[PDB]
């Protein structure tokens, strides 16, 4: 069992390099528009307290060097759309896939196409944290996506590293996830928690894959489990979460509350130097939907 | 810090579905040739003791349904090339990237484009184990690759799951990694070991990323470390491995043998319930080259 991203081909065809001043970062070229973080116009000094409207007036179309692979695109318009820079180019992308802009939820996973060394360089899978951060030099940024049947659902664009090393960004409409702004100040993240629903989902995956030792013959309750969860900084389980785990519960023959009892035991008793799916930690970056999609 | 694969776009354009009988699996369409595991011609019963030459004579061109996305390719020839089925089609792939066939070495990493539910479905990074296995239902197989500048280096194609759940396959010439054959028999893997060089490389990455607690003020020697390594089923360190870690040693200011002393301590003393890069286990699936490529 492994953490796997969606194939990145369709997103690769949309990735461009946007340069303004000394700042070079990644953009998304869809039809005749390029999207990138608006702080591309900021010197690493404007970032302290940026008046973006003011800084943008100082910019013209020629302030922006947009490079699609090894073609320089001619920029014929610029505007601000929330925290995104909206760039109009003279050519519409012939590799534009069918796409939607979705705003994902805390606990939900997505694939990331990471820009390093001035181009699309790597791909990995991650989860939006309950505190709206991302655990994701020469970074030129990154695009988050899921592939929903025939369509690319763009959900994330990287903007900032916070002083703690955790990342913040926006959806593709330019609206930040969580309480964050694109300003180099003392923005503290909310206290993070483990995504319970995902941990249970991954436990089901372990059972599918042969790891059974953590199973016991006790059950629990939503009220009891959530006390334990509160203590261990886990997300509270709701009835919605239980209903979601239905298919996996049927597949394994282990009732969701029985699996919660196994988890409760694992939090209080540890793992005694054992492994679940080659892991000594409890993994929370697989949704039930990711588990279903892998087996099978 | 995260395990990331190469972007998969160039490999996605080469992936086809090859059907023979009830067996459907993934092929690689390059120019006018499709490559897939030869056991596509076997019923899950021929697999016990397959005479492949004999089974192939019974097949004709019409025995093979080759589907590129949603185009059925017409197969105009078939032959066997080691453990690969070599299929000749009437159309050469217009999405053929620049590519090489490389045979990688134990300890070396590669990206995998995994075929699930009858199409390219997922992407992840992995290492060839020292015992020539892969830690990688509805599996239709998978292609292993690195992207070496402008060129795709194909290094792996999945063939078999062994009775222990570990995977075996070939390079793209059809030659198995390790002592394995494409036959459903009692093939036991060699005893696996941890890739030392990669563990040191990842420790350097931890130091780059701020984790420093495991550093001490002792050094060790190749002869001393290798006794400890033997005991803990780690690969012996060679002078080649030390020279390879040079750039990372210079970057961090930590001499390779000093880092070995930190590792030696970690093997004998554990981690006392601490973490390195969010991990309580020692990670061996990043080469020095992967670490350099990420930071930066």
Curated annotation (Swiss-Prot), chains A, B:
Domain Peptidase C30: residue ranges: 1-296
Subcellular location: Host cytoplasm; Host Golgi apparatus
Reaction equation(s) it catalyzes: TSAVLQ-|-SGFRK-NH2 and SGVTFQ-|-GKFKK the two peptides corresponding to the two self-cleavage sites of the SARS 3C-like proteinase are the two most reactive peptide substrates. The enzyme exhibits a strong preference for substrates containing Gln at P1 position and Leu at P2 position
Topological region Cytoplasmic: 1-296
Location of the active site: 39 (for 3cl-pro activity), 140 (for 3cl-pro activity)
Coiled-coil blocks: none
SUBUNIT field: Exists as monomer and homodimer. Only the homodimer shows catalytic activity.
Annotated function: Cleaves the C-terminus of replicase polyprotein at 11 sites. Recognizes substrates containing the core sequence [ILMVF]-Q-|-[SGACN]. Also able to bind an ADP-ribose-1''-phosphate (ADRP). May cleave host ATP6V1G1 thereby modifying host vacuoles intracellular pH.
Name assigned to this protein: 3C-like proteinase nsp5
Entire protein: shown range: 3243 to 3541 of 4382
């Amino acid at each position: 069992f492994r953490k796997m991203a969606f194939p990145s081909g369709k997103v690769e065809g949309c990735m461009v390099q946007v340069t303004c001043g000394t700042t070079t970062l990644a953009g998304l070229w869809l039809d005749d528009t390029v999207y990138c973080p608006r702080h591309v116009i900021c010197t690493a000094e404007d970032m302290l307290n940026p008046n973006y409207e003011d800084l943008l007036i100082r910019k013209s179309n020629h302030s922006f060097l947009v490079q699609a692979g090894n073609v320089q695109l001619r920029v014929i318009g610029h505007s601000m759309q929330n925290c995104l820079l909206r760039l109009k180019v003279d050519t519409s992308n012939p590799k534009t896939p069918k796409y939607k802009f979705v705003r994902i939820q805390p606990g939900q996973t997505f694939s990331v196409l990471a820009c390093y060394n001035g181009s699309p360089s790597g791909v990995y899978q991650c989860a939006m944290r309950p505190n709206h951060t991302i655990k994701g030099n020469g970074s030129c940024g990154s695009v988050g996506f899921n592939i929903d049947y025939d369509c690319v659902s763009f959900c994330y664009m990287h903007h900032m590293e916070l002083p703690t090393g955790v990342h913040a960004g926006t959806d593709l409409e330019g609206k930040f996830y969580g309480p964050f702004v694109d300003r180099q100040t003392a923005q503290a993240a909310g206290t993070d928690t483990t995504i319970t629903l995902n941990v249970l989902a991954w436990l089901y995956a372990a059972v599918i894959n042969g790891d059974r030792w953590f199973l016991n013959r006790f059950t629990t309750t939503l009220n009891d489990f959530n006390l334990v969860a509160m203590k261990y900084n886990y997300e509270p389980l709701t009835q919605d979460h239980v209903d979601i785990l239905g298919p996996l519960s049927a597949q394994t023959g282990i009732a969701v509350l029985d699996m919660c009892a196994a988890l409760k035991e694992l939090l209080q008793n540890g793992m005694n130097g054992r492994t679940i799916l080659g892991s000594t930690i409890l993994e929370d970056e697989f949704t039930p939907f990711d588990v279903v999609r892998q087996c099978s």
